[PDB]
Amino acid sequence: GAGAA
Amino acid sequence: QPLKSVFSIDAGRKYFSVEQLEELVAKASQNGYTDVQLILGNDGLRFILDDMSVNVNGKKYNHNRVSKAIQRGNNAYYNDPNGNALTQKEMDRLLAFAKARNINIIPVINSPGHMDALLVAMEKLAIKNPAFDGSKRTVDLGNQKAVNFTKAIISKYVAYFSAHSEIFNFGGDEYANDVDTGGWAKLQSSGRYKDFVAYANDLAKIIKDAGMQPMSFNDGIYYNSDDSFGTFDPEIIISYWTAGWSGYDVAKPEYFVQKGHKIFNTNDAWYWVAGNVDSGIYQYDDALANMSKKAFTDVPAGSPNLPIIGSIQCVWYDDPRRDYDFERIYTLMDTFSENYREYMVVK
Ligand SMILES: [Ca+2]
Ligand SMILES: [Mg+2]
Ligand SMILES: [Mg+2]
Ligand SMILES: [Mg+2]
Numbered sequence: 001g002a003g004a005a
Numbered sequence: 006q007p008l009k010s011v012f013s014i015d016a017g018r019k020y021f022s023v024e025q026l027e028e029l030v031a032k033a034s035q036n037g038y039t040d041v042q043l044i045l046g047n048d049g050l051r052f053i054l055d056d057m058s059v060n061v062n063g064k065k066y067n068h069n070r071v072s073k074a075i076q077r078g079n080n081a082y083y084n085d086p087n088g089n090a091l092t093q094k095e096m097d098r099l100l101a102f103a104k105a106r107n108i109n110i111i112p113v114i115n116s117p118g119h120m121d122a123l124l125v126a127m128e129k130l131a132i133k134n135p136a137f138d139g140s141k142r143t144v145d146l147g148n149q150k151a152v153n154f155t156k157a158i159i160s161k162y163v164a165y166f167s168a169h170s171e172i173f174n175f176g177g178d179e180y181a182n183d184v185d186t187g188g189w190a191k192l193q194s195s196g197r198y199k200d201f202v203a204y205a206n207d208l209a210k211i212i213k214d215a216g217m218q219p220m221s222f223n224d225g226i227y228y229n230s231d232d233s234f235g236t237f238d239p240e241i242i243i244s245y246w247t248a249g250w251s252g253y254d255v256a257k258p259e260y261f262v263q264k265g266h267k268i269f270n271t272n273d274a275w276y277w278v279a280g281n282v283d284s285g286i287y288q289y290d291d292a293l294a295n296m297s298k299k300a301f302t303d304v305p306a307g308s309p310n311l312p313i314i315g316s317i318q319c320v321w322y323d324d325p326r327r328d329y330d331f332e333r334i335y336t337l338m339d340t341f342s343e344n345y346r347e348y349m350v351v352k
Contacts, residue, residue, distance in 0.1 A: 002007075002347050005302060005310055 009315025017047025019325035020088035034106035036342035037349035046114035078122030115176030167215035177221035202235035239265035248306030258307035280327030
């Protein structure tokens with residue numbers, strides 16, 4: 001997964 | 006958005022053969038990088054087009070003279086036993102190899118610094134005093150004939166790569182750094198930094214007119230955090246490698262973001278100078294260790310969470326007599342991609 005930085 | 010991930014190789018100081026660059030591109034693809042930055046003009050100019058002829062300053066210089074002049078310039082910088090320059094047929098082959106493996110190539114043809122070979126070439130072509138006084142590596146921004154010749158040469162590489170690449174890195178780092186680290190400060194006090202702003206903007210326009218995005222290293226752009234010599238085209242992507250040091254007063258990353266530049270994180274924590282294994286600058290062990298410390302998005306001295314478009318991991322051949330060390334290069338690339346896997350998607 002990957003977040004919204 | 007998803008971020009780019011770039012492996013950069015210094016094939017300007019040191020000759021790399023075409024199959025070596027292919028192996029690097031294959032490794033980059035395997036490891037989930039999106040791009041390979043191929044430094045070709047960096048002290049040496051180790052890629053020569055089939056037609057290097059230029060018409061500039063009211064004079065014509067044919068391919069024979071220009072190509073031979075560049076080859077002599079390469080040998081004056083470092084007569085590398087392994088080779089002098091890649092050919093256009095070789096570069097066409099390399100670009101096709103990258104395309105088949107989902108890798109974009111970012112070329113670098115450096116100026117106004119890091120251009121020893123092109124300076125010698127200009128001298129052989131009868132252009133008087135092209136170098137900035139004291140330097141064998143940097144063109145004199147006060148010498149319009151030398152500057153215009155340099156721009157004409159860069160334009161030839163821009164035209165060639167425009168069919169293949171999205172970003173063109175004109176470099177722009179380390180003005181007159183064979184003399185000392187004070188080159189940008191001296192350009193500012195002398196007044197000539199205004200002409201550097203114009204030069205960078207001129208190259209940016211050449212690149213944009215060819216359909217690509219321009220990129221430069223950060224250190225000379227808004228040096229001393231000073232916009233009063235002129236503004237830079239905000240479409241210049243900033244490859245941000247150093248936050249500076251004592252007497253090397255470079256703008257912070259946020260300075261560029263406030264002005265609308267995109268940032269390509271080129272953190273020198275990830276640098277490796279080939280041959281510096283456990284001693285010297287930019288050592289192998291430190292590069293590996295820093296890949297498990299820095300976040301992918303950590304820009305030197307940046308305020309937290311400035312936007313970036315991606316990150317660039319660099320291998321340098323400051324001393325091109327050092328051997329190829331692909332075993333260490335591949336360990337560095339493996340370690341970078343494993344630590345930054347969530348940003349570097351692979352099957
Ligand atoms: Ca160390
Ligand atoms: Mg430069
Ligand atoms: Mg600007
Ligand atoms: Mg700066």
